[PDB]
From a paper:
Calmodulin (CaM), a 16.7 kDa protein found in all eukaryotic cells, has been extensively studied as a primary calcium (Ca2+)-binding protein. CaM consists of two homologous (46% sequence identity) globular lobes; each has a pair of Ca2+ binding sites (EF-hand motifs), connected by a flexible linker. In apo CaM (Ca2+ free), the α-helices in the EF-hand motifs are positioned almost parallel to each other (closed conformation), whereas in the presence of Ca2+, the α-helices of the EF-hand motifs change their position relative to each other, forming an almost perpendicular conformation (open conformation). Ca2+ therefore induces a large conformational change, exposing the hydrophobic surface and facilitating binding between Ca2+/CaM and a number of basic amphiphilic helices on target proteins.
In the present study, the IQ peptides derived from Nm and Ng were present in the crystallization drops; however, no electron density was observed to confirm the existence of complex in the crystal. This crystal structure of CaM, in which no substrate peptide was bound (hereafter referred as ligand-free CaM), adopts a unique trans conformation that has so far not been observed. The crystal structure of ligand-free CaM was determined by Single-wavelength Anomalous Dispersion (SAD) method and refined to an R-factor of 0.20 (Rfree = 0.23) up to 2.02 Å resolution. There are two identical molecules (RMSD 0.7 Å) in the asymmetric unit. However, the PISA server analysis and gel filtration chromatography suggest that ligand-free CaM is a monomer. The Ca2+ ions were well-defined in the electron density map, located at each EF-hand motif. Besides a Zn2+ ion was observed near His108 for the first time in CaM. The ligand-free CaM molecule was in an open conformation, wherein helices of EF motifs were perpendicular to each other. The CaM molecule adopts an extended dumbbell-shaped conformation and the two domains are well separated. A close examination of the current ligand-free CaM structure with previously reported CaM complexes showed that residues Ala74-Asp79 of the central helix (aa 65–92) are unwound, and bent by ∼90° near Arg75; this reoriented the C-lobe in a perpendicular direction to the central helix. Thus, the present conformational change observed in the central helix of the CaM is independent of the bound metal ions.
Author numbering:
A (entry chain A): 6 to 144
B (entry chain B): 7 to 146
The structure:
């Protein structure tokens, strides 16, 4: 456990009174109340929306992690996209090359022709440089 | 950091014609330049241990495998595990449904609770409701 997952798993399961894997405004409100806080039904749905990546109005364990990390959903989202980008950028120079895309896609089970790889890099290459950078990846 | 600049320096030495790939011909020239007379078979062999895409020649990412001391199967397994780690947000060794949904969404694939639960279904071989590493390797 990191800056403790185990503790966050503890916390989450306190909040998630009914064990359904999500924390509602209802359940969130009960806990805040127990600590002598009086949030409104809007303050609560706001607390949830800060982290509600799948937009369902409720907090699942992953999104709960965002909360615990202090982050908003947009920031958490950007960390995850970067971890993805890093899987492809094997040499870590900030750009995915055609060879890297082909190499890693193949290693992840998706064998692509030199045709399909060159096309995928074409499409995403906005800077015009023959390589896919982080901002370019983000689409 | 310095490792990669020197690996990049090395690759360009080998890849005399700036191709972006290293052939048995080019590989053989450098070995010849130093101590050895490898056979065509020995060279094709050297390449085959890192040729992930099977095209018979060494590109730069495959060249990194060599320089990491690895074979292609080992390199491949590390890259899968890095992928698995993107999904396993809490790092306990299992991709939950909530995790798959959460990370797919954040990578620009919004899936229904329906499709996520199906995806975990199909890859979940031991029936525990979660996708472990070996199960992930199978799904890919
Ligand atoms: Ca609940
Ligand atoms: Ca570019
Ligand atoms: Ca190759
Ligand atoms: Ca997990
Ligand atoms: Zn949610
Ligand atoms: Zn997240
Ligand atoms: Zn790169
Ligand atoms: Zn060449
Ligand atoms: Zn590799
Ligand atoms: Zn399983």
């Amino acid at each position: 456990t990191e800056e403790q997952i185990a503790e966050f798993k503890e916390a989450f399961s306190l909040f998630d009174k009914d064990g359904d894997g999500t924390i509602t405004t209802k359940e969130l409100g009960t806990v805040m109340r127990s600590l002598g806080q009086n949030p409104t039904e809007a303050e609560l749905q706001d607390m949830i929306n800060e982290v509600d990546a799948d937009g369902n109005g409720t907090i699942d364990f992953p999104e709960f992690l965002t909360m615990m990390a202090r982050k908003m959903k947009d920031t958490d989202s950007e960390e995850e996209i970067r971890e993805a980008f890093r899987v492809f950028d094997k040499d870590g120079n900030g750009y995915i090359s055609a060879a890297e895309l082909r190499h890693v896609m193949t290693n992840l089970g998706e064998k692509l022709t030199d045709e399909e790889v060159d096309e995928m890099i074409r499409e995403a290459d906005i800077d015009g440089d023959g390589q896919v950078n982080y901002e370019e990846f983000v689409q």
